[PDB]
Structures are given as structure tokens and as C-alpha cells.
Design an enzyme around this catalytic site. Structure first.
Site, PDB file in Angstrom:
ATOM      1  N   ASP A 140     -58.756  -1.875  -1.547  1.00  0.00           N
ATOM      2  CA  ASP A 140     -58.590  -1.481  -2.942  1.00  0.00           C
ATOM      3  C   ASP A 140     -59.829  -0.707  -3.432  1.00  0.00           C
ATOM      4  O   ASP A 140     -60.478  -1.061  -4.433  1.00  0.00           O
ATOM      5  CB  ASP A 140     -58.304  -2.740  -3.806  1.00  0.00           C
ATOM      6  CG  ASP A 140     -57.764  -2.474  -5.192  1.00  0.00           C
ATOM      7  OD1 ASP A 140     -57.563  -1.270  -5.552  1.00  0.00           O
ATOM      8  OD2 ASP A 140     -57.655  -3.431  -5.960  1.00  0.00           O
ATOM      9  N   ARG A 144     -63.060   1.545 -10.359  1.00  0.00           N
ATOM     10  CA  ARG A 144     -62.953   0.282 -11.119  1.00  0.00           C
ATOM     11  C   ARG A 144     -63.521  -0.867 -10.279  1.00  0.00           C
ATOM     12  O   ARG A 144     -63.872  -1.913 -10.824  1.00  0.00           O
ATOM     13  CB  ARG A 144     -61.482  -0.013 -11.528  1.00  0.00           C
ATOM     14  CG  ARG A 144     -60.525  -0.194 -10.316  1.00  0.00           C
ATOM     15  CD  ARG A 144     -59.057  -0.443 -10.658  1.00  0.00           C
ATOM     16  NE  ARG A 144     -58.295  -0.376  -9.402  1.00  0.00           N
ATOM     17  CZ  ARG A 144     -57.795   0.746  -8.895  1.00  0.00           C
ATOM     18  NH1 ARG A 144     -57.837   1.872  -9.594  1.00  0.00           N
ATOM     19  NH2 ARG A 144     -57.233   0.746  -7.693  1.00  0.00           N
ATOM     20  N   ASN A 145     -63.613  -0.661  -8.940  1.00  0.00           N
ATOM     21  CA  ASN A 145     -64.138  -1.688  -8.039  1.00  0.00           C
ATOM     22  C   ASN A 145     -65.570  -1.443  -7.607  1.00  0.00           C
ATOM     23  O   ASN A 145     -66.009  -2.059  -6.642  1.00  0.00           O
ATOM     24  CB  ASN A 145     -63.200  -1.887  -6.813  1.00  0.00           C
ATOM     25  CG  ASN A 145     -62.185  -2.979  -7.023  1.00  0.00           C
ATOM     26  OD1 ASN A 145     -62.446  -3.976  -7.721  1.00  0.00           O
ATOM     27  ND2 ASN A 145     -60.984  -2.787  -6.464  1.00  0.00           N
TER      28      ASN A 145
END
Ligand code: STI
Ligand code: FYW
Ligand code: CL
Length: 287
Positions: A140, A144-145
């Protein structure tokens, strides 16, 4: 006493819970059960992930186990665990400027220039080259990570956002929540995940950096993304993006996973790309 080095039950990662002053839930609840904390003896702010009341115990302990195996300047660093008795804790370092996506969207652009965005992309590629060498898969990878620290330090993280995040970032696909716009086509169509599908997501992440955090495939319905990619459509070169950087995104987005570069090659490309030329000059030329 498990806490003593003499004990055959000793685990260097196990820390005394009382050493942590637990404060409020981080970022208004955007990370689930993650709290801001203070590590007493070091007067250090930390991030503390916990489990919510009452099978996910095995996924949590598996995350703790994986984190003990990874150490890199551009990967969020495990500081310790509280896994002897519930409530289970995973303690990491706190990153001042928080997640990269919001940071890109809110940053002062004279400070976060083309040179800084290049440094952020290069740091992410180094963290990913390490995961590739250690035979791990992220699954992922996206802005945002990632987290931002002092002096434009960037660390790749994995917040398990799929079932927490609100809005259409993650949507239902194959009995789970997928971030469709970052997902490699073979992952959507054949449930195939590999380091090469992280390469594809890296290409999307590169496009997020290149646009100061714009949402990918803007104005395109999620139902159309696979069909478009299968028919060779790709996001256009962002305004001001150097051609060499866009060439690297396009290489990440090869339909065949085997045709995509490895993260070692991507990292080597960032180092070489602007060894003589200035990214600032290339951006100014493009604009
Ligand atoms: C408190 C915590 C607990 C666990 C994690 N874990 C990870 O970030 C992580 C990173 C890489 C892997 C590697 N892994 C390889 C295998 N594949 C399948 C998954 C990924 C796993 C976990 C992070 C944190 N840190 C964290 N979490 C949420 C928010 C914040 C945070 C927010 C704002 C400012 N500073 C920090 N910090
Ligand atoms: O520096 C910029 N791009 C860049 C790309 C890649 C790169 O390499 C890296 F490896 F990816 F980091 C480094 C820098 C940049 C400069 N000005 C912009 N401007 C938008 C129009 C005016 O406001 C100037 C935009 C822009 C803003 N919003 C949306 N799209 C592009 C971007
Ligand atoms: Cl893995």
C-alpha cells in the site's frame, strides 16, 4: 523476570509500559488506535499503536514481528513493543510534520522546491530498495503512508488505512478495500502482489510528489481505470515535471510487471539523473 537480560524469556524490544506517558489519539482519529506518547527517560514524543476492544491480534503481532526485522533511515523505526499482556502496544518514533500527502498539499512552496521534492522521492526509493533486497512487499505504497520529519526527512510507513480512511481513496474490490488508483493492474485483475506491484504504486506516489499531492486520474471514474490502463492510457506528464522524471513514472507503469524497473534501478536513476544538471533548471525550462 522477563525484563532482565538473564531471563530466557528476555526480548530486547519489550519495554516497560510505565515508561510511556500515553496522551491523545493522533491526527483526530485518522490512524485508528494510534496515540501520541512520551518516552519518560528520553523526554521523547512517540507514536503508540494499540488494539481496539475485542481475531486481529495475530495481524498486530505479525506487524510487530516484521518491524523487528527492518532497519533503514527511510523506514519508520520501531522503538519497542508491549506484547507480554494486553493491551498490546507498538511504539515508533513520532515524525514532526506528519503524513506526506497533507504535507505536500499544505507546504510553503519556496521551502519545498523541486530540489526538496527530488530528495523526498529519492528517500522513498532508498526505503523501497531495502524492502526489495529483504524480500518484503509493501502492498500500500502512497504519500498518505509516508511521514515527514525535520529537514525534509521522509520515512515510508504502513498505517493499515484500508478499513479506517473515509471517502473514496479505498473502495470495495475482491472482498477487501483497495486504493484502486495506486493498484497495479495485475493486483486488481489477478490478485497478484509483488515488489513490481509496489513499483507501480511508487510511480503513482511520484506523480503525487510531482503535483504537490493532487489526487491521481482526476475526473476519471474508478470503474474506468482498469479499462483505460489496459488500453495503454497513462496519466499525462504533470505541469513542470522534468521529462526524465516522467520517463521514470512511465517505466513504473509498464503493463508487464517484469518490464518495470527494480527499486535498486529507480534509486540509481534518481542519483544519476541530476548528478550534473539541476532539477530546478529542468523544472523552470518545462514551465
Ligand atoms: C505507532 C506505529 C505502529 C506501527 C507502524 N508500522 C509501520 O509503519 C510499518 C512500516 C513498514 C512495514 C513493512 N511491511 C512489510 C510487509 N507488508 C505486507 C506490510 C508492510 C510494516 C509496518 C507505524 C507506527 N507509526 C505511526 N503510525 C501512525 C501514525 C504515526 C505518526 C503520525 C504523525 C506523526 N508521527 C507519526 N506513526
Ligand atoms: O517542482 C515541480 N515539479 C517537480 C516534478 C518532479 C520532480 O522530481 C521528483 F522526483 F518527482 F521530485 C521535482 C519537481 C513543480 C513546479 N511548479 C509547479 N507549478 C504548477 C504551475 C505553477 O504553479 C508552477 C508544479 C505543479 C503544481 N501543481 C500541480 N502540478 C504541478 C510542480
Ligand atoms: Cl512481505
Amino acid at each position: 523476570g522477563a525484563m532482565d537480560p538473564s531471563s530466557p524469556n528476555y526480548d530486547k524490544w519489550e519495554m516497560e509500559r510505565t515508561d510511556i506517558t500515553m496522551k491523545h489519539k493522533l491526527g483526530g482519529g485518522q490512524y485508528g488506535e494510534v496515540y501520541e506518547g512520551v518516552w519518560k527517560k528520553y523526554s521523547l514524543t512517540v507514536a503508540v499503536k494499540t488494539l481496539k476492544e475485542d481475531m486481529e491480534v495475530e495481524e498486530f503481532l505479525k506487524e510487530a514481528a516484521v518491524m523487528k526485522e527492518i532497519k533503514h533511515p527511510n523506514l519508520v523505526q520501531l522503538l519497542g513493543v508491549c506484547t507480554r499482556e494486553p493491551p498490546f502496544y507498538i511504539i515508533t518514533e513520532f515524525m514532526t510534520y506528519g503524513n506526506l500527502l497533507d504535507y505536500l498539499r499544505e507546504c510553503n512552496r519556496q521551502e519545498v522546491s523541486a530540489v526538496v521534492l527530488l530528495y523526498m522521492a529519492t528517500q522513498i526509493s532508498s526505503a523501497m530498495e531495502y524492502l526489495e533486497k529483504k524480500n518484503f512487499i509493501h502492498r500500500d505504497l502512497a504519500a498518505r503512508n509516508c511521514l515527514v520529519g525535520e529537514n525534509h526527512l521522509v520515512k515510508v510507513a504502513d498505517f493499515g488505512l484500508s478499513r479506517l480512511m473515509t471517502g473514496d481513496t479505498y473502495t470495495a474490490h475482491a472482498g477487501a478495500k483497495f486504493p484502486i488508483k495506486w493498484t497495479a493492474p495485475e493486483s486488481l485483475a489477478y490478485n497478484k502482489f509483488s515488489i513490481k506491484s509496489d513499483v507501480w504504486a511508487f510511480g503513482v506516489l511520484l506523480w503525487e510528489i510531482a503535483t504537490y499531492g493532487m489526487s491521481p486520474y482526476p475526473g476519471i471514474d474508478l470503474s474506468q481505470v482498469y479499462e483505460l490502463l489496459e488500453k495503454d492510457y497513462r496519466m499525462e506528464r504533470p505541469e513542470g515535471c522534468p521529462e526524465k522524471v516522467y520517463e521514470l513514472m512511465r517505466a513504473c507503469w509498464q503493463w508487464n510487471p517484469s518490464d518495470r524497473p527494480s527499486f535498486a534501478e529507480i534509486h540509481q536513476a534518481f542519483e544519476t539523473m541530476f548528478q550534473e544538471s539541476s532539477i530546478s533548471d529542468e523544472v523552470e525550462k518545462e514551465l
